[model samples]
Target: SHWLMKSEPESRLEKGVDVKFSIEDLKAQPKQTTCWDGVRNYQARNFLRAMKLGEEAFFYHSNCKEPGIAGLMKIVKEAYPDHTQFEKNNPHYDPSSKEDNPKWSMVDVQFVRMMKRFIPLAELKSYHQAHKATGGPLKNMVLFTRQRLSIQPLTQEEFDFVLSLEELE
Candidate 1:
């Protein structure tokens, strides 16, 4: 089992967004959990399906000015049919998606705990920039190269690295 962070970047505003849900929303879930659905992109949808039960995901805020990792979430549900694609007029609705053969999927995540600090984008970029040539610790991070896909998997090392970015005080 692994993890990923799904969020809207400043450059992404095609139709729907990572704004579909908020950290507050996740925290507000009755059991501190909420079903994540409405992913339109096939690539991201695939990533959603790849998640496993009990995996931890870093709930990142990508479109924010100082975008970075924020809190944590545990994958409670593996994957399921995303009925939203068949919903008329929904932001992520897909006209081509058949009710019998759905084109999208979603997962359920439960709020874990907020990080001590927001690990800004610049901080993540630095890790890649400084180590890319040296096969740096985070050289394989998906966030650096792919900005469009909201869902991205992370290595355990990378996950740990981001968590270590908590505030000094």
Candidate 2:
């Protein structure tokens, strides 16, 4: 299965590497838990439904001076009912979702590694080969469309193409 991850480019400046949220990091937390929360898009929610355990994903960061693929991740778990939808006080809460039946879903992704350097959106726009490689759905990728600050997915070809740019870093 394929998936997309998101992070802030500025996070790289602070970490000295592309920003990433690792499964290890989440597991290290007290509850061995993390929330794939804050989803507001129906399309994106559907993508989450497609995730399966052990699926690899491309990590992309948006809403920065330069938005692009920053790392890789693997889905550690499959989609389950997203609990956030049931919480009345949660920003992502949905009054329609109930304990027995859920309207929202999410998957668990474990951080893999940062790319040598971010493969910036501008770089992708300029590279005809890369453009051709990822030219289908990605031609109108959510990054270029909704521009949401969240995780999404990369086609298998797109994932491999972006990984090729890693050597330049």
Candidate 3:
């Protein structure tokens, strides 16, 4: 799901891309119910729809002084038409998308836990360099090659490697 994975920690965590939805607001949602919507990009939209229930994602903060992974979240809903995409009042509305054949989708996510350490992008880049020699899990992360995609897929190994960093902090 859009995963609420790339918004800064503040308020009103929703989905789409690049917009500022805060992790602080995420904790406020009932059961931390966040219906990640608003993705306008085709690839990002597909990533959101690809999520399975109970899948975990890294809550990453971007376009900030310190861009990094700050927390964990899980997908609570799978692919579904984004309600906001059909509403004229919503900025994410697409003129081409019809109710019966909507082009955009979203998923619900819940906050899992805050990371013991907010792994900075620089640290992640360093991991890439240190492990680039042996093809470690972080060596091949898409986050290094493409920082533009708000939603990204991770292998269990990659996810676990990141979690391992929690111990180092």
Candidate 4:
């Protein structure tokens, strides 16, 4: 199974706050009951398309007091036309998208769990191997790229690497 991780740019946010999350916090729910809202990026939309039913995800709260993986989520359903596209009042609305040919897509993500302790971004960066194994070649990490913040795919190896840090013992 594949995974996707989300994070906010550290430089844009205030100092001392770090990103964190724990899988143990997840709480699975019924299928087709949740909605993956507020996505405006094209690449993120593509990722949403690739997401399958029952796929698990990590809900990371970016640009917050404590940015990190705060809870677990699962893709209860496949990608569909985002309703936000049609709502002009909604911030995510796009005038370009039409009802017949929607431009934006999204999926349902249900809450899994919320961790007691947050796994900070600083800590993840400290692990050289984890960094290298994830996002490819340490420096090429999509996460390390400047001025970009959105959900991205996590290879199976990368997923396992992150799980290792949680110390599932």
Candidate 5:
């Protein structure tokens, strides 16, 4: 299955650790892999829970001046309890969640490669406009319809279209 996960590129401190982790930051991680954590929203959590091993995901830069699709990643590990929620000093910490039954889930993703070119949100929105009338592949992308979701699903056609955009440019 295809997916998109958003993270901030600009620096924002959370318990002294910058929460603004971008694709570049993911690349810098050991083995270019990290647990896709800190997701607090229940709806988004369900999407994470649905992920399967080897599924591809687009790494999108968000909460920054220039938001866009930055790179590609693949799920290496499926859903597990997000550890940040149990940490008192962590920004994503939730006091109500018990160890036995966690309220959040996360998956481990391995960076595949950066996009051939950055596809800006504006570009995508523009394409959405063109596709909307014809019921095109990108017409109902969760990126636009479910605007506030940090983790969103994408159809195979939607995924291929975005990748095609990177190639054509």
Candidate 6:
């Protein structure tokens, strides 16, 4: 039920809409919620399919100067067909994906709140190392090992430990 979602803050336009959508962008949404689409990776798409309504996830900032966890989000809707996959001009478009047999899925997430402090990757990497030494919760975090996946799963223990940092420092 715990997860981490990555987005880029810097502008990377695709068909006029910035593909590098950050937490601030999510916050500016009409209802502070949006369909988490454009995930083409098979593993990440499966993770999205596994998501349930009401699940919580960390809003991570990736491919940026200070890449880190920026805020939190909650799944408002379960997995559904990602509309972008069928769009012809969208960067996420897949020519082979048909509406009847969608090749990707997306979940709707509502903006929760910003992390008390931005937990940079360096700090997280340090903690990841420390945790390994002590057999701690984040010892085997997917974020560290599977660095390329934009969406990653998190254990409850790992989720709590990371949230705990917001109050610790």
The candidate that wins on lDDT is 5
Question: How high is the CA lDDT of each candidate model?
Answer: 0.76, 0.64, 0.76, 0.61, 0.92, 0.90
- For each candidate in turn, the TM-score is 0.86, 0.71, 0.86, 0.72, 0.95, 0.94
How many clashing residue pairs appear in each of the predictions shown?
0, 3, 5, 13, 0, 0
State the displacement of the C-alpha of residue 83, model 3, in Å, after optimal TM-score superposition.
1.8
- Segments in model 5 whose C-alpha atoms lie over 4 Å from true places: 14-17
As a TM-score, model 6 comes out at: 0.94
> 1 or 2: which has the higher TM-score?
1
List the candidate numbers ranked by TM-score, top first: 5, 6, 1, 3, 4, 2
Worst 10 residues of 4 by lDDT: 13-22
Candidate 2 lDDT by residue in tens digits, 1-169: 5666664435333223343443345445445445565565778878887777788776665545766776666777777888867877665678878788787887776666667776877876656334547664345454554556365666666566566777775
Model 4 residue 51 lDDT score: 87
Instruction: Kindly indicate the candidate among 5 and 6 with the higher TM-score.
Output: 5
The TM-score measured for candidate 1 stands at: 0.86
- Candidate number of the best TM-score: 5
Give one digit per residue, the lDDT tens place, for model 6 in 12-118. 77667778788999999988999998899999999999988888999998865788998999999999999989888788889888898898999999999999988
At residue 44, candidate 3 shows an lDDT of 80
lDDT tens digits, residues 43-120, model 3? 888788778888788888774567788788888778789998888767677789899889988888888888897788
Look at candidate 3 and give me any clashing residue pairs: 10-22, 11-22, 15-37, 16-38, 16-39
Looking at model 3, which ten-residue stretch has the lowest summed lDDT? Answer: 10-19
* Backbone clash pairs in model 5 (N, Cα, C under 3 Å; residues 3+ apart or in different chains), count: 0
Off by over 4 Å in 6: 13-17
Residue 115 lDDT, candidate 3, scale 0-100: 89
